[PDB]
Design a protein around this ligand. Structure first.
Ligand SMILES: Nc1ncnc2c1ncn2[C@@H]1O[C@H](COP(=O)(O)OP(=O)(O)O)[C@@H](O)[C@H]1O
Ligand SMILES: Nc1ncnc2c1ncn2[C@@H]1O[C@H](COP(=O)(O)OP(=O)(O)O)[C@@H](O)[C@H]1O
Ligand SMILES: Nc1ncnc2c1ncn2[C@@H]1O[C@H](COP(=O)(O)OP(=O)(O)O)[C@@H](O)[C@H]1O
Lengths: 723, 249
């Protein structure tokens, strides 16, 4: 269909002016990784960029960063024309020059720093007019090239004399400035980022179609998550990047006004925004306006929760407006806000995980120029519990520490503090570890939901259980119509039972990982909390959170916990049923047909579990998890030692021999007991620094087995008795 | 880097006009515990103080109390110039004289008490203009030395005839009065005192930098503790000592 045009799409690399083509296009465009290519754009303008070769991209989507797009005036999903330019011709000092307000308090010589490092080792091709952006010294300043000695475009060479100027030509009115947040400023919430963009792509990008079609596009979207997880960030990025007019209501501003000065700004906020359409109204802190409940007193509060309901109703789909509202927990707001036609979509931004806390950290230091040893992987490992704002606060406190150890050491403080001096400034690992030492996990801790990092590589033995579990959890999600051929419902429960420390937890996490599914762990103390606190209404919030995190594995560990707290060898006079397990029964059997929520219980006392859990439509598959065998006891010892260094001198299958049986936990005990005797040696020294066989022999002096061969027979009994 | 300048920092002793140097500096400045030293300060003014020798201080930080700093116009973290003055020359009755409102209901003869005990056993060196402060009888009254018979500075000796006056010259508008609380008025909360000063040092002391840098300085701080533990005290001291405008809701 005249394959010249191509779509624009996001790109992974940090560098500017690099487009990443789909590899089965090589000889079509005929141009390799050494050829720069001209790209057509809106208001009659272009750019030229060197090309990279990668597998994962789609065929039709060019991958390029924000700066190369803004000048093109392409917004993601737009199409550009890609035509080669082998005809490239080098320049002699293209003239480059500072812009915006960015251009903040800088002074002196910014060219040996904000240019010369960047142009070097590069040959970065530059067409006159590009905004190409540089970063250093806790700031991103971009230099627009106003003049190119040859034209239109030029490679840069190390041999072009370089022109010191530094004058502040103000940015033109019509371009929308770069400082503003795009999608690449959002680190760690991306699964849901596709979700919001999917909802809003067609309404915001294509106003014509919904006037040319019968259908209803989403009227309002409810972003919810703990505070500081980037909900405002998301709304702004989506608005800024689609180009739609972003209006911002925040609850306390509306609540700041007097009665009738309030709802006027509110009903003006939409009657102002529906002009500028397509537009996004972001109502964050929707709890401030709209907790319509028992708890509000007064008419004027109840008035404002009203009229918000009827501005939601008032948009007739001739409004191109999308309404986003940020909330913290969903029960927070008035339930009539969720009527269909007000806030129909509900999207949970959630706490970022270790794998996500990395990207956030890497977004909030892109201007710093760090120090070489800090790896941001273990920085991202000990920041657990931090939302993305906690993370932004960490690295800014890191950078204010390092500015405390240096600089004003001399007291160089002048009118405008020097450029080259902050670029020298670097922040080492001893700053960040000092940044964490502060209170910063002052944000929320509630039930986590993320893909665990335990692959099957971590579980010694249990081969048959590993394949049994895959069938239970995998085959239904992958191959449904096969289940439909025999008219079968996949069983959605499992109950692991066996002695303690045999890996019932590991297996559950391992299988969530193999599915790349979310894993919610409800541990024993949390069920006991509901049972003492007589609050089993919490079990509903647990399953609805699995439903929103689906596909997920929901794991009840120590499901016998409440049965124990009642005794159970003699125990109370009652039956097996109790408050909390009752609500687990209720919420299980009353759950949605298949949302890919798979329920795993685990127990070390299958004896005293109530049998109602067992009935079909519940945890329906009992899987015994035995004490390991020396076959497995070898892989248990290795999967523990696959991190810490273990010299060849100490040998395994002989340790794994001497134990008639231990738990996989008793073996980790031995391992960790040995590794303690080692570090004891290494800290002391020197006044050698690795593990040794005699470390493990002193460890084995304390090796105890927690399972007494009595109850294995008891466990052996529950096995054949049940079938 | 032209090691003349040095930073100002807090000091443990109760007495006035004593700066406590870092001991591995002895022969650099070449001056021992028997030499008085001239220190440069803002709006073209100085002071001279005898020196003490201690281990725990940093190398770059002079340790001196509030009174010796206020006239210097140095606020902690500022830098002053330290140059020796073995050339010291004694005075004959520097003229000293009461100031502020402090100067409250006092009367009769305050010189046998608010001066003569303090000058004694001392040789306290005094440059014309110093505010050096004395305490007695449930009040702290400070006497500014308006006139020095030789100049600029003088040791005091027990042999200088002493001038009874006691007149209330009102304090000049531009100096920020001593009665106001500093860090040394806060006794027992100090671990967190370093914490608040760490948070607020760079934003309050260096307004230029956060305009010259991308970053966000702390917007608000929440002091909490049982009532009467000095939370207002802390906020005022930090404000008064960095010099920033303190508003109180
Ligand atoms: N996922 C994220 N990626 C990058 N930055 C984030 C993320 N989440 C939060 N932040 C940072 O946290 C700060 C607070 O974000 P904001 O959206 O105001 O919080 P909330 O989510 O409560 O609305 C923002 O300045 C943003 O830079
Ligand atoms: N079969 C095993 N293979 C590897 N490690 C194990 C095994 N069993 C136990 N462990 C180690 O012991 C710890 C406790 O095991 P856990 O998963 O709690 O089992 P359970 O739930 O049966 O008590 C885990 O951290 C795990 O690393
Ligand atoms: N750590 C302290 N050191 C010295 N004085 C203190 C201290 N804490 C309290 N005070 C005294 O207690 C009085 C009450 O202090 P104030 O700051 O008003 O109380 P709060 O801490 O409730 O704000 C102040 O006059 C102050 O002199």
């Amino acid at each position: 269909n005249r394959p010249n045009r191509l779509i624009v799409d996001e790109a992974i690399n940090e560098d500017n002016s690099v487009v990443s083509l789909s590899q089965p296009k090589m000889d079509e465009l005929q141009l390799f990784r050494g050829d720069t290519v001209l790209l057509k754009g809106k208001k009659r303008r272009e750019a030229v960029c060197i090309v990279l070769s990668d597998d994962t991209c789609s065929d039709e989507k060019i991958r390029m960063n924000r700066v190369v797009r803004n000048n093109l005036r392409v917004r993601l999903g737009d199409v550009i024309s890609i035509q080669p330019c082998p005809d490239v011709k080098y320049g002699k000092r293209i003239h480059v020059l500072p812009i915006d307000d960015t251009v903040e308090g800088i002074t002196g010589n910014l060219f040996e720093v904000y240019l010369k490092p960047y142009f070097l080792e590069a040959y970065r091709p530059i067409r006159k007019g590009d905004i190409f952006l540089v970063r250093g010294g806790m700031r991103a300043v971009e230099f627009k090239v106003v003049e190119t000695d040859p034209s239109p475009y030029c490679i840069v060479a190390p041999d072009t004399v370089i022109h010191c100027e530094g004058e502040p030509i103000k940015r033109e009115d019509e371009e929308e400035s770069l400082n503003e947040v795009g999608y690449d400023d959002i680190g760690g919430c991306r699964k849901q980022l596709a979700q919001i963009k999917e909802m809003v792509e067609l309404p915001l990008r294509h106003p014509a179609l919904f006037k040319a079609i019968g259908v209803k596009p989403p009227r309002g979207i409810l972003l919810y998550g703990p505070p500081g997880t980037g909900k405002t960030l998301i709304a702004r990025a989506v608005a800024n990047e689609t180009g739609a007019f972003f209006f911002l209501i925040n609850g306390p501003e509306i609540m700041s006004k007097l009665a009738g000065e309030s709802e006027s700004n509110l009903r003006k906020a939409f009657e102002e925004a529906e002009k500028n359409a397509p537009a996004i109204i972001f109502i964050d802190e929707l709890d401030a306006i709209a907790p319509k409940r028992e708890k509000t007193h007064g008419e004027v509060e109840r008035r404002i929760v009203s009229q918000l309901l009827t501005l939601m109703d008032g948009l007739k789909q001739r409004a191109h407006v999308i309404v986003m509202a940020a909330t913290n927990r969903p029960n927070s707001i008035d339930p009539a806000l969720r009527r269909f036609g007000r806030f129909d979509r509900e999207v949970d931004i959630g706490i970022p995980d270790a794998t996500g806390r990395l990207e956030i950290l890497q977004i909030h230091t892109k201007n710093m120029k760090l120090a070489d040893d800090v790896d941001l992987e273990q920085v991202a490992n000990e920041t657990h519990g931090h939302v993305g704002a906690d993370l932004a606060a960490l690295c800014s406190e890191a950078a204010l520490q390092a500015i405390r150890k240096k600089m004003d050491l001399i007291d160089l403080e002048d009118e405008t503090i020097d450029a080259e001096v902050m670029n020298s400034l670097a922040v080492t690992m001893d700053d960040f570890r000092w940044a964490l030492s502060q209170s910063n996990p002052s944000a929320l801790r509630e039930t986590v939901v993320e893909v665990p990092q335990v692959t099957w590589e971590d579980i010694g033995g249990l081969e048959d259980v590993k394949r049994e579990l895959q069938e239970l959890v995998q085959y239904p999600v992958e191959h449904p119509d096969k289940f439909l051929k025999f008219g079968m419902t996949p069983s959605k429960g499992v109950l692991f039972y066996g002695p303690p420390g045999c890996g019932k937890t590991l297996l559950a996490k391992a299988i969530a990982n193999e599915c790349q599914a979310n894993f919610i762990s409800i541990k024993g103390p949390e069920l006991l909390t509901m049972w003492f606190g007589e609050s089993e209404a919490n079990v509903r919030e647990i399953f609805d959170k699995a439903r929103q995190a689906a596909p997920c594995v929901l794991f009840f560990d120590e499901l016998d916990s409440i049965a124990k707290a009642r005794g159970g060898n003699i125990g109370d006079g009652g039956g097996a049923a109790d408050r909390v397990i009752n609500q687990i029964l209720t919420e299980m059997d009353g759950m949605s047909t298949k949302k890919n929520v798979f329920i795993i219980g685990a127990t070390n006392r299958p004896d005293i579990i109530d049998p109602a859990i067992l009935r079909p439509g519940r945890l329906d598959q009992l899987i015994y998890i035995p004490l390991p065998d020396e076959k497995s006891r070898v892989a248990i010892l290795k999967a523990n030692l696959r991190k810490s260094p273990v010299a060849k001198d100490v040998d395994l299958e002989f340790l794994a021999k001497m134990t008639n049986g231990f738990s996989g936990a008793d073996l980790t005990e031995i391992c960790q007991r040995a590794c303690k005797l080692a570090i004891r040696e290494s800290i002391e020294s020197e006044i050698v620094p690795e593990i040794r066989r005699d470390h493990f022999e002193e460890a084995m002096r304390f090796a105890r087995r927690s399972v007494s061969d009595n109850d294995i027979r008891k466990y052996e009994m529950f096995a054949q008795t049940l079938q």
